[PDB]
Amino acid sequence: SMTEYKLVVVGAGGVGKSALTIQLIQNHFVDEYDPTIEDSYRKQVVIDGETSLLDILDTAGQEEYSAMRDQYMRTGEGFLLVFAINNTKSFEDIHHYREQIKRVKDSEDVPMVLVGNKSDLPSRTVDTKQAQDLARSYGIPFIETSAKTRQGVDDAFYTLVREIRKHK
Amino acid sequence: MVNPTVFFDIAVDGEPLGRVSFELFADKVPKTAENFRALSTGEKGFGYKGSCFHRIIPGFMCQGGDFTRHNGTGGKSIYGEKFEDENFILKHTGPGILSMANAGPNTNGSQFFICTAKTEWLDGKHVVFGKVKEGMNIVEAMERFGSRNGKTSKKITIADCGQLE
Numbered sequence: 289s290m291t292e293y294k295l296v297v298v299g300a301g302g303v304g305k306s307a308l309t310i311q312l313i314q315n316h317f318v319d320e321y322d323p324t325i326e327d328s329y330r331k332q333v334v335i336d337g338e339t340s341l342l343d344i345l346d347t348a349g350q351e352e353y354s355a356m357r358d359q360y361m362r363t364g365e366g367f368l369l370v371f372a373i374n375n376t377k378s379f380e381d382i383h384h385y386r387e388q389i390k391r392v393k394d395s396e397d398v399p400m401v402l403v404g405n406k407s408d409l410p411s412r413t414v415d416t417k418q419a420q421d422l423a424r425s426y427g428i429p430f431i432e433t434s435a436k437t438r439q440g441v442d443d444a445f446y447t448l449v450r451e452i453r454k455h456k
Numbered sequence: 457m458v459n460p461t462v463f464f465d466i467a468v469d470g471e472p473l474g475r476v477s478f479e480l481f482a483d484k485v486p487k488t489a490e491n492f493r494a495l496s497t498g499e500k501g502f503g504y505k506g507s508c509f510h511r512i513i514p515g516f517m518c519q520g521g522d523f524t525r526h527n528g529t530g531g532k533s534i535y536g537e538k539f540e541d542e543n544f545i546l547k548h549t550g551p552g553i554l555s556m557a558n559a560g561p562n563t564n565g566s567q568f569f570i571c572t573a574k575t576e577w578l579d580g581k582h583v584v585f586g587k588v589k590e591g592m593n594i595v596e597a598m599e600r601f602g603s604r605n606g607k608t609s610k611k612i613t614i615a616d617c618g619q620l621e
């Protein structure tokens with residue numbers, strides 16, 4: 289059977305984790321805010337000529353439950369670190385998510401992709417330069433996305449799969 | 457000055473389940489209690505009648521009250537789309553507590569939740585404004601239609617609601 293990849297989407301509340309996942313799975317854009325408890329999805333794709341089954345865990349940004357993430361971080365194989373380009377706080381929260389994943393998995397070599405979402409909005413507060421520099425310091429790719437226009441949606445999930453393949 | 461009582465007649469896939477009544481603590485949170493009362497009578501031309509309990513998580517709570525979009529994201533108060541946190545005097549002490557759902561500070565609309573356990577970590581973040589008076593066993597019966605992430609397996613609706621004398 290095709291290889292399965294356990295992908296986890298993390299980041300602050302409201303940054304577009306669910307909008308990105310639903311765009312990937314269902315090819316439409318949720319414009320309303322339905323804050324997530326926890327949702328799981330599956331999709332088969334072809335990446336670099338190899339068919340793969342994506343198991344996607346869409347997590348809660350709700351920050352009062354930060355002490356509840358260890359088990360899904362242990363299980364997950366790769367992580368989309370999502371911030372919104374118009375929310376500097378969500379960009380600052382990224383370091384905390386990466387540190388938590390590295391700590392919980394007790395490893396410096398965890399597949400991750402930095403995702404700056406909402407790239408369709410004019411109210412940018414996070415420079416592309418700041419995001420690229422951060423991802424360069426983490427040694428991970430950086431993808432700019434819009435769940436509204438679908439820009440970069442496939443690229444972000446497919447790049448994470450490529451990171452996981454390199455890790456095996 | 458007597459706290460009002462309101463009722464929900466609950467249905468499961470359209471079949472009657474039973475009645476839950478609530479005391480509303482108008483003596484401590486009058487603005488929030490009045491919102492829920494008016495939405496339960498429908499007297500403003502809109503309210504809870506016919507809406508669903510869209511999120512039921514066994515061991516924690518039953519949440520409902522989105523009568524504007526019927527998908528868990530909507531709802532509105534009698535004061536405008538949202539209104540402020542009136543106070544946090546009352547706490548989430550155990551099963552039966554009736555409290556406002558929200559999307560952060562000062563975003564109360566119509567969505568609410570009924571605790572099925574003590575949820576003290578919500579103290580100071582959600583406005584408690586009432587308690588189940590009769591029919592807690594109806595709320596207990598609603599839990600089996602829920603799940604870990606709150607998705608329901610049958611349609612749990614407020615078939616009828618109003619104020620008791």
Ligand SMILES: CCn1c(-c2cc(N3CCN(C)CC3)cnc2[C@H](C)OC)c2c3cc(ccc31)-c1csc(n1)C[C@H](NC(=O)[C@H]1C[C@@H]1C)C(=O)N1CCC[C@H](N1)C(=O)OCC(C)(C)C2
Pocket residue numbers: 321322323324325326348350353356511513516517519528529530556557558559567568569575577578582604605606
């Ligand atoms: C970590 C996983 N998780 C969990 C969680 C927490 C625990 N423990 C915490 C306490 N310790 C001591 C023991 C372990 C155990 N198990 C789980 C669940 C079962 O694991 C899957 C919760 C939760 C809530 C949100 C996101 C993730 C979440 C969330 C996401 S939006 C939210 N809250 C607030 C919510 N706004 C809305 O709906 C807005 C849209 C409308 C207008 C809201 O006003 N209300 C009312 C109050 C209840 C709340 N909804 C809700 O549903 O709470 C679910 C609950 C299970 C109670 C908490």
Ligand SMILES: Nc1nc2c(ncn2[C@@H]2O[C@H](COP(=O)(O)OP(=O)(O)NP(=O)(O)O)[C@@H](O)[C@H]2O)c(=O)[nH]1
Pocket residue numbers: 299300301302303304305306307308318319320321322323324325347348349350405406407408409433434435436437
């Ligand atoms: N313009 C624009 N809006 C977006 C984009 N992605 C998400 N949004 C909007 O931002 C809001 C929150 O999105 P959502 O995907 O629910 O965010 P989340 O990260 O899953 N939130 P939570 O952590 O509570 O589950 C919604 O109104 C959604 O439509 C995007 O790329 N562009």
Ligand SMILES: [Mg+2]
Pocket residue numbers: 305306307322323324346347348349
């Ligand atoms: Mg979400």
